Design a protein around this ligand. Sequence first.
Ligand code: PAV
Length: 326
Amino acid sequence: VTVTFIPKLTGNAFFESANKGAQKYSEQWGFKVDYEGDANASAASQVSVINKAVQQGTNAICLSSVDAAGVKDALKAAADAGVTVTTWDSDVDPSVRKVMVSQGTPEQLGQMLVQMGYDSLKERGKDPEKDAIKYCWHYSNATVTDQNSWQVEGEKYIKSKYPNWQNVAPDNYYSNQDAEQAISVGESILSAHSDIDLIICNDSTALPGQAQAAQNKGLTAKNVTITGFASPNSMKQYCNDGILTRWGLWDCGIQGAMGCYMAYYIASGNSVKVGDKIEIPTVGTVEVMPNSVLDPKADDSDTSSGVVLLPERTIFTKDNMNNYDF
Ligand SMILES: C[C@@]1(O)OC[C@H](O)C1(O)O
């Protein structure tokens, strides 16, 4: 069996680390993972990668989507060619994939982002419980499924728990997963909103780009609070240089491996339904959940379509970041 493992883009540390995990585990499990993507985060590029993998006779795809709508037709065609379709990281329409391996619910992840920001704000001498904290979100793009679901839940949480906070840029800032653009956009936020208190960077490119922008402006964690999601090796130097205090992620290597395992398990002829408990060798037992764990409006009618959730997420600071190497 070959699983084609497709990232939102290659050459970003989150996706490279996820593939390192998929490669390590699939070698032990006895199947091939073909890592295929593009340097740009582009739905049209992902369609081309999907089509080429189908044409080459891949048995399965495990995809993290930059835009669900833009890959729907290609994934329907993949399934009609006999290819098992799964997702990880950022989902698509659940009617066109079997299992999604997700890092957490949008409520969990949106609240985690806000809580990291709250903690870092308090540590630089603000009173986030009461202050009119000025903030905004900086991430990849306005349509991707994962990051927008977190923004929606994080905004609901802020408006409920911290009504005094002020979103100074409600349209959000977008840097398209382009490393150089994330720096430039990070600089734009700090120039146009120079008194901003918190920038929530729920994207693995926006977070290091925003930290670099702050460093370019001579700022440290004492001036402005930046938090978000990124693999820890990409942020250690910024943290050692005092640019930010705290950010988060989860075990993206095991996540990529799990997504590829689910694709292999189904492509090998095993049926998977919501409620099943599946023993993934050397990882543990997972439970397939209904699609509505990621969106309460999701249709749960098809029990062959479901979600596996990672059991934990990770908050990094200078005190634990050196325990990790990805
Ligand atoms: C790590 C992350 O926030 O940035 C890129 C990934 O797709 C992600 O999980 O959204």
